[PDB]
Every structure is written in structure tokens, then in C-alpha cells.
Amino acid sequence: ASLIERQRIRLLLALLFGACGTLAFSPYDVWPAAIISLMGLQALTFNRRPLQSAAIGFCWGFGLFGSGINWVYVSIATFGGMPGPVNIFLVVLLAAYLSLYTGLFAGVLSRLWPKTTWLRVAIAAPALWQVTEFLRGWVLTGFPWLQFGYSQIDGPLKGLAPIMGVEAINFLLMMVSGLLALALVKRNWRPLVVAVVLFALPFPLRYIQWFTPQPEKTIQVSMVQGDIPQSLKWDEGQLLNTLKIYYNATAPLMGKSSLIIWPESAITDLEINQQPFLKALDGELRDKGSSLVTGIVDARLNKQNRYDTYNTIITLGKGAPYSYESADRYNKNHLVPFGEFVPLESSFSRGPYIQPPLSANGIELTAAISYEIILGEQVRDNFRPDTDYLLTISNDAWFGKSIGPWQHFQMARMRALELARPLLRSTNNGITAVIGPQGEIQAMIPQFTREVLTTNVTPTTGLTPYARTGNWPLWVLTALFGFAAVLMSL
Template sequence: MKLKALLALFFGVIAVFAFSPFNLWPLAFFSFIGLVALSINVNAKKSAIIAFFWGLGFFGAGVHWIYVSIQQYGELPIPVALLLLSLLIGYLSLYPALFAFLLNRLAKPYSFVQLVIAAPALWQLTEFLRGWILSGFSWLQLGYTQLNSPLKAYLPIFGVNFLNLFVPMLCGLLLYLFSIRHRIHRLTIYLVVVSILVFSVITGYLSPIHWTKVDTSRKVELALVQGNIQQSLKWNKDQLETTLSTYKQLTQAHLSSADIIIWPEAAITDAELNQQDYLTALDKQARENKTTVATGIIDVRYRHHDIDVFNSIIVLGDRVPYAYLNDNRYSKHHLVPFGEYIPLAQLFKPIAQLLNVPVSSMTAGERTQPPLMMQGFKFTTVICYEIILPELILDNFQPDTDFLLTISNDAWFGNTIGPWQHLQMAQTRAVEFGRSLIRSTNNGITAVINPQGEIIDQLPQFEQAVLSVSVSPSIGETPFAIWGNWPYWSLTLLLFLITFWFKIRK
């Protein structure tokens, strides 16, 4: 049992190397096969323990970077920071443990039903729960590891959730074939070979297809401003004037050359109401140069005896002069637990107070909001963490959307793998929707991504710079943008029905 737990820990760790910045995508298969193989031929309780250790390895190696924001920027003593990080990793590890426990109870070990039908369905169920309970944390889904594999061809058709289901299915099939290798019939071998060939042909046919078309008749000159304001200083009141001066200075050189200038999330670290003179002057200057400026800002609204605080992006310099609460803005809908709001406030409020987060009681914007309009182009917009939520973008995406836009501040996570994982998920959104994606950040990774998920250009991390790039919009829709997650949910439901049918018949 101890050996299996240690092996499970190892298999969990190596899965992280399938994600960015390492991109060794075959390790995702190797890791999941190891998880299932170790946990299915024991009783349900031992199965859950083994999978829990897999989770400790996976999430311990995969989200250790949260320690930077807890300890360095939350200003907690190291033992307390390590305790909170351990609690988070332990909590996340409960989901693979639940997966293994249910898999053990629902089907016969090493059966086709268990490995190929029940396993992917149960994995997707527990992953859904991980992304939903307490508003969720759907980071490190296995589907993202396939951005650089041949399976990428299925992203614009079915989306990343389908790959998160399909990867375990392929792993289960490989494990099942290995388990019956001594009693396999010749006909079965032929069927497997033919199936692999057919799958390879289909994948090869789909890979070069571009579901959307770049409209080269239209073009926009972008300037993405990376202020590189240190997170330890960012919210210091004495730093505000320096921050405002920095962004204004970096912007000046591009007012006459860029059509659209984009500042990152909360570039202006003050309430929008407090900066009306600054915003009005910048708006006037942008319009005089026929340029548009979009910036992240905190919008504080007072109502009766309460206060609403929104994490917003506003547009300046457009056709209509800037006015507070104008329509051309986006307010973040999906807030980050403990960072932007407190789930189950009465229970977790002491933890939030410990973390010393500058803005931890924010208000969610509407789930569906109009696209931002800039220079006649439509931008479907999300802020920071929201880029990992394809369902949210589906609800806001329109057939005539020109670009996807996300602004972020990954300075919370320092020089770790966290920002690279975040960028990988943004690349996946570009592929799913067949649109170029614009990503402006405080200290990196600022980048422009094409509809195939490839980085056109990017800025180095931790440098104060401006990324200038010319981009054309895309027209048309990918199958995923039209269908959404219906095919994936239908397949998941079918797998569950088959699993329970066999269970009942038994």
C-alpha cells in the first residue's frame, strides 16, 4: 500500500510536465494510466487513498506557485502560508480520490466498462465538481495538455472539456488492451489496428482545417502596455501617482501610431470616481489622436448603506467622450475565491483577514455583457481568471465578434509556472473560438495569439515595455462556438447510462 501511494505521488507529479511551459503532452497519458492502474485492483477505501496521493503530487507540483501570493503578498508567516497551501492541495486532492472510490464501486476491475466507459465519465464528473463547488478552481484540466498534440484538431469542434473526457477514455482503452494481452483474439487485434488507422486519418484530415477565416481587408494596430509594477507596491497609496505617470508615459509614444492601446487589469489602482480628471484628460488626448485606450480599473459605486466594487475595463477615446458609467465597459463576472470575494463569508472570513488581500469583497458583474467596441471592432472580453472558463465566453461570444480580449495581473505569482499555465489556457480559447486573442498583463505574459493558438508576438516577463502588433480580425464560427458543450455533455451522459445499465444488469 505504501509503495502504491508513493508511486501514485510520482505519477501525479509528472502530469504537471505535460502542461506549459514544459509541454511534454504524452506524460498526461502516462500519468492517468498510472493513477487508474494503481487504484482499481484494491478495495474502495484503499483506492481513494491512492488517488488522494496522486492528487497531492499533481496539485502540489502544479499549483505550488499560489504560495507566492499567500506568503509574499499576503504577508503571512511561512508556517501559516505553508499550512494554507497544504489545506488547498489536500482539498483539491479529494476530487481524484472521489473519482477512484466511485470507479471502484461502479464496475468490475479491469473490465471494458470500468476502464473505457465509467472512468472517463466519472473523471469528468469530479472535474466538473472541482470547477463548480465554492465557485470552483478548474485549473490544470488534462485537456489543456493536448494543445500541442494531434488532438488539438478537436478543440475548435468540441472544446477542451471534450479532450478532458477523451484523454481518460484513450488511457482506459490502452490499459484495457494491456490487461487482456494474453487472451486477445486475432480479430480483436485487427479491429484495434483498423480503429487506430481510422482515428489517425480523421485526426490528420481535421488538423489543417481552419474553421474561421482571417479578414485581411481589415486591420488594427495594437499597442499593449506592460507597466511591470511590482505587486508589493501596486496597491500602496504612495505608488499611485508613479503608476499613473508610468502608464501615461509609456502610452504617449504610441498615441499617433496605434489604433487601440490596452492597459492591463487594474492598471489604475484607484476608484474610477477618484480619477475623473485623469480619465477625462486621457480620453480627450486619445480622441485628438484618433486612438482608443482601454484600461483596467476599480469601479466603486455607493448605494444606500452599501458599496459595490467592480473589477472593470473601460474604454477611452472612442467616438463618444468618456463619462462615468458609460455603456462601453466590462465588469468581471467570475470572481476569484479569497482573492476577490469570500465564499461562505462567516466561515472563511478569518482566512481572508489573514491573507491581507487589497480587494477581497468585490461585486460580480452580469454574466452576459455586450462586447467592447473599439475603432469599429468588437471584442469579447474577460478579465484574468475568467479566460479559463469557456462556458463564460460562450455566453458572451457573438458570431460577429472580431477578437477575444483578456487583461490580467499575474504579478501575484512571481517567476513561477503559474503565468505560463494561464497563457496556455488563453491559447486554447483562441483555438476553440477561431479568433485572435489579445492578452495585456502587468508584468507578463503579454501576448497576441492567432486563431490556431500560436503566439504571434509577446513581451518578456518582468520588463516595462509596449508590444506593438498589427492584427486582422476573423470571420465565421467554429463548431464549438455554435454547439457549445452539448456534444460533450451528451457523450458524458451516454457513458453514465451505459455504466449504470451494466451495474443494474449485474
């Protein structure tokens, strides 16, 4: 009974509608919850003053991020080792910082398009949501966690991703959710019909196969989930058992699996420190028909008498003879704030933004370390037409035993769909899996086990429209909409 037009009631409902958006992502996977969450954001800001709207947008974000990324508590607790209330204080600060961008979006949309109208809801909102979400993923190196439409990896809109990227699905979901909110508030059937047509049109695109599989190039791949406990991983006494654990798991696979993979920083020692182990392993792998890629840390002495420490992937074995001077390697480019460096200016150095694909046993792998797999444009920029598989290695203990590793895993799936390549995901303990060229999960082992995933995987060829272009077609769309919306407010 009309309680909705009290500002404090709008703030509370925004928290609920924002929290509802968390159900859209893995492991919950209720993709309609993304539309309901966006409907609340669009509707709760109708007929509000700009700062009233910004507060509602902030509270929507606080429910979304407060419920969606509170697993970073485990990251902070594992990193800092401080009492609980201290880590809660930092988590609330994180969710509050990210909610500035959802409040930015609501405040500006209310300031420039105050009226409840199709223009505000279907033209201005998706274009401005694209800008404010870019800023969230760019400012201070950014944190673009939780974009709806990553929830469409198994949904009716998935065919959009190979054409224009996952951000196109962010764009369309906001558009459709606005017109549903518009139809509800104005009690009008026309915006609902347009919303249904807009939602339904991209459905036949999921029956498009942009890739060409190569069945006779199929190889057996093994991914060693060593499951080193995080409290022990970097202890100096653990190093010798870690190398034992991984070598013993790999020995029965040599000569059977063409490609063997160890996860991020599996060898918890400097690369210069392990030349005896690496050289011996390389020869045994070459003598059998096998190849190995593994994570490690590299403190490399540079031209100016100093060491740049990297989070790196190295290659060994058949078709990739190991050498400390070999260019057949990958250095992490996008480091994690506080975890791997500090925003001010022992830290990690960054590899180049674009690095060549890894080569191993005649296989070409486009690599990204952990978090980097969510950087869709960056993964696309490193992709090459001759890339056979996408590769990501990660240590998802930093994501908790919670929803964290599943949200990370979900977004890695989008890379395979966007580029029409199989994705090899090797992790220390959290969701090791092979993803097919359409985002489907071909093989997977349970978390928190010490075992290896061995299966057949088939490489693909072909270029999706998104692999050809990248983000610029969507950007010219938000520019055309932004130009039109700004002029329409004449």
C-alpha cells in the first residue's frame, strides 16, 4: 500500500534486489535473477532526485557486492592472518568502493534523464551502464567482478558472446530489464512486447558454430591438481615434498598424455634455483612423447643489474626443450592489488600486455594466469588465429571454499565461448576442468582433491566475429546510443 515512495524503503528494497543478482552467478546459476536484479535497479530509481537515486544505486550495489564478493574475507584472512572483525572491516570497504560505480550510474541517469521513459530505460541506461562498468574495471587497475550475462553462459543469450563479447550481453540485459521495469511502472504492454522481442531475437544465434574441430589432432591431456594446502604452499620445508608430489603424479602419464599441466606457481621456488630438477624432467619428458607446462616464479636479472620477479609459465619436454633463455614462456601482466603489488608509486613485475602463445609438442596455447582469464579484451588481444587451446592456471585457494572459485570458473568459461577454442583450466585445488569451444564443461574433477584430470580434447580452428574485432563494435554502439540519448534530452 504505497510504502514504496519512502526513500528509506527504497534503500532497503535496493539492498534486496542487489543481493538477488548474486543468484545469477555460479554456483547458483539462476539467470532470471539477473533480470529481476536489474529490474529493481531501474525501477527503484524512477522519479527520484539525482542524489536520492545515487544512494539507491549505491545500496543496490552494496547488496550485490556485499553478498557476491564477501568471499574476499577468506582472501584477506589467508593473506593477512588478522582477526575476523578486521577482515570484515576491509570487506565492507571493498563492497562500498564498488558500489560507488553503481551509485554513479544511478545518479547520472537520474540527472540527465529524469522521466520514466523508454529513452532513459532502453537507450541511455545500457550505454551509461557500459561506461560506469568500464570505469569499475579500469580505475586503479580495476575490479570488474560480477557482470551479469556471464550468467548467460548456459542461457538463451549465449550466442551473442561470439559476435560482440560478453559486454554486449551486459548491454542487452540492462536494456531488456529496463523495458520490463518500464512496462510494470506504467502498466503498458508495448514495452513488454519490445522487451520480449529484444530478448528472443538472439536465440537462434546459439545454433551457430563458428569453430571447426580437428578430430585427428586430438591429444590426451593431463592436468595435475596437486592440492598443496595454502598454509604450507610457500613454507621452505614444503618445497621438496611439493616437487615430489607433482613428479610422482606425472611419471605414470609420460608417454601417454601429449600435454601435462601444473597449476599457478606449482614449483614454489625461483627458476634459477631449480635448473637440475628442470633439466632432468625435460629430458625424461622428451624421451617419452610428452610435454609439460607449469607455473613457477622467476626472479630474472635484468640489463640494469636488478631482478624483476615474475609470476610465470614455463614449458618443457617434447617440442619445447626447456632453457632459462627460452622465449617459450609467459609472464603475468595484470597483477592483483595488495596481493602482488601496491597501488602506490617485494612486488611482482608485469609481463608485456601482449605475449606470443606458448608452444609445446606442436600445440599453441594462449595463456592467462588466474584472474587474467576475466580480462576478456586482453585474452582476445593475445589470441592468435593459430591458437589451438586457451590455457589458464590458477590457485583458487585465494577465492575461498565458497562461491568465489565458482564465479571465477564461470567467467573463464566465457573466454572459450567468445573465441571458439577449448579452454584448459589447471588449478591447485579449485575447479580443474576442460571447457569446450562453446563454453560447455567437457571434463571436470572435484575440488580439494589431489588427483589429475586425464581426458581427450580436440583443438579448433576458425575466427569468431568477436575475435576479429574485439570491443570496438559495442563501443561505437554505446557512442551512438549516448549521442542519441544526450540529444534526445533537448
